[PDB]
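tool_call predict_complex ligand=NDP
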Amino acid sequence: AVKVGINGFGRIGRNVFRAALKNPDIEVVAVNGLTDANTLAHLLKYDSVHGRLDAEVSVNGNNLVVNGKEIIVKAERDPENLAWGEIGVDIVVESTGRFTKREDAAKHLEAGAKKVIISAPAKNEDITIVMGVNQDKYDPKAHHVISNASCTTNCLAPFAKVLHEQFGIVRGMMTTVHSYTNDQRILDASHKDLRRARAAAESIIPTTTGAAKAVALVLPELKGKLNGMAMRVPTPNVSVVDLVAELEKEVTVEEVNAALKAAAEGELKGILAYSEEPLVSRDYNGSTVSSTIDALSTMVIDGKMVKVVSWYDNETGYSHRVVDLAAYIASKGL
Amino acid sequence: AVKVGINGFGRIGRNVFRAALKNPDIEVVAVNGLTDANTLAHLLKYDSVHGRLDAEVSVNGNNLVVNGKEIIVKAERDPENLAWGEIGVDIVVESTGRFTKREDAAKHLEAGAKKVIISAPAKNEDITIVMGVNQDKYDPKAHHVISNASCTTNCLAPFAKVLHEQFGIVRGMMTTVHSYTNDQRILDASHKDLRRARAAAESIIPTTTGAAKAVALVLPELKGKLNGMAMRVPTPNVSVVDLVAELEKEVTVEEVNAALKAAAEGELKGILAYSEEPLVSRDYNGSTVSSTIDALSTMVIDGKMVKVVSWYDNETGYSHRVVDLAAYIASKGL
Amino acid sequence: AVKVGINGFGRIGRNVFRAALKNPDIEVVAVNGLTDANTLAHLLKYDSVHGRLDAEVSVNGNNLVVNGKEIIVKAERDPENLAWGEIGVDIVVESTGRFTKREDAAKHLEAGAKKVIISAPAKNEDITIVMGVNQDKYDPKAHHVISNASCTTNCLAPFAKVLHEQFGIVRGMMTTVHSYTNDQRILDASHKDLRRARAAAESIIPTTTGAAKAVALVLPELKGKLNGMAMRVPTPNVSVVDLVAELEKEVTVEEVNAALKAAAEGELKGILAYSEEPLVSRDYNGSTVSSTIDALSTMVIDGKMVKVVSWYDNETGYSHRVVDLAAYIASKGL
Amino acid sequence: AVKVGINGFGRIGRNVFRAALKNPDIEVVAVNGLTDANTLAHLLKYDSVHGRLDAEVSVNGNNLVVNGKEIIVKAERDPENLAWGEIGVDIVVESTGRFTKREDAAKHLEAGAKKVIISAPAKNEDITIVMGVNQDKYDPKAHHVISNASCTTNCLAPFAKVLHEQFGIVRGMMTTVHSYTNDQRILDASHKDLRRARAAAESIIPTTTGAAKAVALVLPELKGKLNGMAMRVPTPNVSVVDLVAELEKEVTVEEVNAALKAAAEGELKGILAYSEEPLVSRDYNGSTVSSTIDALSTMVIDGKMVKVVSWYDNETGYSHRVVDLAAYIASKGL
Ligand SMILES: NC(=O)C1=CN([C@@H]2O[C@H](COP(=O)(O)OP(=O)(O)OC[C@H]3O[C@@H](n4cnc5c(N)ncnc54)[C@H](OP(=O)(O)O)[C@@H]3O)[C@@H](O)[C@H]2O)C=CC1
Ligand SMILES: NC(=O)C1=CN([C@@H]2O[C@H](COP(=O)(O)OP(=O)(O)OC[C@H]3O[C@@H](n4cnc5c(N)ncnc54)[C@H](OP(=O)(O)O)[C@@H]3O)[C@@H](O)[C@H]2O)C=CC1
Ligand SMILES: NC(=O)C1=CN([C@@H]2O[C@H](COP(=O)(O)OP(=O)(O)OC[C@H]3O[C@@H](n4cnc5c(N)ncnc54)[C@H](OP(=O)(O)O)[C@@H]3O)[C@@H](O)[C@H]2O)C=CC1
Ligand SMILES: NC(=O)C1=CN([C@@H]2O[C@H](COP(=O)(O)OP(=O)(O)OC[C@H]3O[C@@H](n4cnc5c(N)ncnc54)[C@H](OP(=O)(O)O)[C@@H]3O)[C@@H](O)[C@H]2O)C=CC1
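tool_result ok
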């Protein structure tokens, strides 16, 4: 229903396009990338991780045709030259990873767009929203350049919000055993992060994460109470968060799990999910929720230190949340 | 000079042999497996994880000849029929993974060996030892079936000791991101643990570990103070411990790091290591220590919550421990 | 209609089941393994390669329930004690990998079955059949212990048949760059084959194959004309046969490609397929045909030496042909 | 003795460096990249595939100090601004993959160098040399910009030369099951070759090669009698060539294998090795030789068709021939 555009047709760009296909409220009408329509059609149809797209994918001239609907293809590397206004696009998904500072992503608004959602942590964005945690603090008048946050922050927040509401977190650390991404190297090559410079499918690669910090942007009362690290491992997709927190109240594994299960059926249905099954990561590939509690891994020590473990498909769940935010923003009118 | 017999020439047994060649104090004279000498020489000679053995390996009759010395090869399924006496083996390394209970491991004693080291956590053993932490508590008169704990416990124990001795650990949670081992499956197949039943090279597989609780055997005062889990990921060797604990005292990163570094250069030299280089797991493949602190990852929240990260080559570090334990026992006079 | 029993609920055993679920002409009524119904149930439901089973899988005591249907779960490691005769089973799929010699597979007949399908190259079988190539030679009154050959032979026989009737093969050699299977080791371990004893997910492993001479069994015209090898590589599923051959006739890539495409659209429809898309292995995961020609890879040198590349999902394509042979055999009287 | 400069400090540039350290005739005095000295020295020091370099590496100013010798680090994205002449560099190793047209490679000569070796196949290069095959055609007067060929052409040419010399090649096809390289993609991303645009570690990926045809640039008699393709698999290093040739004379495996053994221990020692061991890829990681015949894989059909399989560590063997060629050039006069 609401016209949308995707700048940067990559892992997240193509996955948002795939998710958009089932949302009614929105309609992706144009996409921009650095490649031709034929490459774009191929990468869109066949995916190593997500499989063959189930739709009629074709190319007419330099315009994609998916299930009969024509999508316009651009190759304008400079975001102010896209002309979103010429084609009616109201929402633009910024997923190139290059325009995360508000002044750059703002170029889309220059080009005619009304709202810009950045699929990554940002700088000086008008607002940071994690669906299920603070979409409500959104104002159509004041927020135009919204950050959807990171995939890691999307997994953690929802169940950090419950844990906090319920038992209260005094402090905690998280580690995300995360699959590799396109920001890494196939074989030892230059990278600013000397660890990410190393062969991705060959080692456990410790790296930084600002996801633990970022959650304070959506859960202010958790400011200065969390921190953590990341460990990129040799799987192509699906990651897991392992949170160890000291709470204010005294609990047991059973009360902690009952709490998460309740939210998963209540307020966070669709965002937070609860699994009591002993699954592995390849089983979460295709998961649309942002966070699935591995109930079997919950642990308590001294009645005050919990260990919660959550799964998340960094591409599918996050892409879906981009679609959700898009459609939510659109419903608040613009 | 002390004759060593190895039962179960697999990953730990072969590596223990490899490590044994570097130490003259002991002499491996016998090895028991369930294949021919020819299959053993090849598997000993070519290692996918560690590379070719630097030494002459040959097959004479059905005994191995490594650097001219002939090693007796046995094919006794039943430990009771090994006759370690007939050939003078003094210490036996029990590395089959099948005889971790006193009932079975003791069969080696009844068969003529004086001491047995189980290269894994055991049941009803005379004593559980982690070198550098409590070997001093070994009693040559009272202890015959010795357990050398697990590779995880060996990693965490030596630094847990430091943090505790000098700071005080109220409570802690751990996660070891572990390479996969031969107890897993290449493709989905039957397994007691439905998690380790899944294709090892394809997923991040959460599983259990008694390592955390096993620290209490070697460090009695940390009984019931720490607990944890594991996450098997797609790498062939090298693992890492992630400990998150609450100290008695309020420290800083530098504070913690100073203590671990000091310990490694003095107290726990050769056992505990300290690294300030941003390395990846592959870099630790071949490392002989038990624990190398990834100093760039030490982290503190509030001054009370610490996160320390430590690398350990699960096969090489551990096997050099088995060799050091076997040399220490023998020094107490068999 | 026909009632089926599966002996060895392995990768092939469970994928044959998944395939059968869709077919009304057959009916899986019981499975045997070396584990409990709860383990089999979980393995049948979550697959690391093919994903979750879209059906209702549950347990009823010791029995499996799948979509309202009850499947008998046994755990008899000796075919002699299977009693298929008692439960009404007509066709038994022998997919353990341990009973491929008539002397062992015929036990199923003695146990009351009417036909046995060996899911691998057999010894002293009654007939080896490659659907599409020679199921026509199947005699219902004479053949009862049937071999469905190997996944590689099922890939190769279809197009070698076509090229041979079309231009006639004079001699050729093939290599199957194959995915690793459960017959290999995770990390270096004992194996009847020292190539296969090496860490599977770590190297390109040359190994032997009987698939190319086995072809002679279904197309005797090609006896002593073909030969070949295999190289197991680090992918969990999907393989590709590489055939280079000397032709009786001089041809063009374009002629060779036209023959193959015609056979796929006509005679060999559903077994031999043809593609002109620039695809990779992950793309053929789920494929039901036995052999898919990668036309872009087709080459010709001197108009006499050709090269033909074909894909095959070693688990799915092969699992579907077992079901196909099951229904064919059935229809011919049982 | 002869001062060398390396341009492009990548997998091939750093490996040539490791090689060069161990060669008395050459001396790398300078390297040019596109990143800071510290990033370069960490990449040189730790290698995920080859290990920790045994030599003291440090960064004195913007220069690298290796084993006491200071190496000049430049960061000129443009060849002619390199001033190789000022610092007295005679031979420049071109390993960026960007200056393969003799016109671009000539810019080094513009900048003061006397000779340029392109570590890849070139366009309009002066002479293409494969060590052991045609280094004798090098003319110190006529040749300035020289191509060392590709790792694949270096594996194929030496045994093709032997086969055609002893038996005579009527024609043949080849396939190099090759490891992935930096020109590939981590996860599905834009690429000129749609096969290479796919996740490198996840699939078997069929691609094209110039190798088989490029053989004629070293062995002209073989012009037109060869062609092949490539298949990159999920291994980080070490490749294998699989040639099936229709020979002129009727031979036996023993005869094909005897001729190869002779040359390996005679005329081509150092370049062609011969193995009768059942080895796998990981075993050739670090081989300096250009081609090792897997004697066990040698097979022949109809007395005229043969298949010979050869291993080659694509980074190390090739990096050792560049140094070799460099040293041979130095010997002929600069
Ligand atoms: N992968 C994941 O798990 C997640 C990633 N993200 C974030 O999303 C962003 C992109 O990541 P991801 O999709 O993973 O990576 P990709 O590299 O797969 O996607 C980035 C895309 O941007 C395209 N691109 C670059 N510049 C332009 C341009 N100027 N105009 C048009 N297209 C352009 C690139 O095209 P080309 O390839 O031609 O260079 C590429 O297709 C980053 O901010 C990342 O941190 C957030 C959550 C999850
Ligand atoms: N892998 C690692 O990183 C570490 C492992 N451990 C422990 O070490 C032990 C071995 O593990 P790992 O080395 O990985 O396993 P492996 O599976 O590689 O080796 C096990 C060996 O035991 C042999 N074996 C089994 N039964 C017998 C028997 N009855 N008589 C003689 N030989 C026998 C096997 O022969 P065959 O192969 O023919 O079946 C096999 O080589 C386990 O207890 C494990 O928990 C502890 C620390 C680290
Ligand atoms: N995988 C492939 O790509 C293909 C394999 N094949 C052939 O299929 C056959 C099966 O192979 P695959 O599916 O890969 O292997 P798996 O190991 O997964 O399956 C073998 C099944 O055999 C079971 N089994 C072993 N002994 C018994 C017994 N005595 N009684 C009951 N069940 C038993 C195993 O149980 P458990 O694991 O609990 O011990 C397992 O469930 C082999 O002949 C193989 O050559 C043919 C085409 C394709
Ligand atoms: N890899 C192998 O197995 C083999 C490769 N080759 C050939 O070697 C060449 C490079 O291969 P490989 O090492 O694999 O690739 P890499 O990408 O690892 O190396 C490319 C190197 O060149 C650098 N670079 C790029 N442009 C410039 C520039 N303008 N000035 C200075 N430095 C530059 C890159 O730096 P940066 O990373 O910061 O961009 C990088 O260090 C190619 O021609 C390849 O075909 C030949 C035999 C074997």
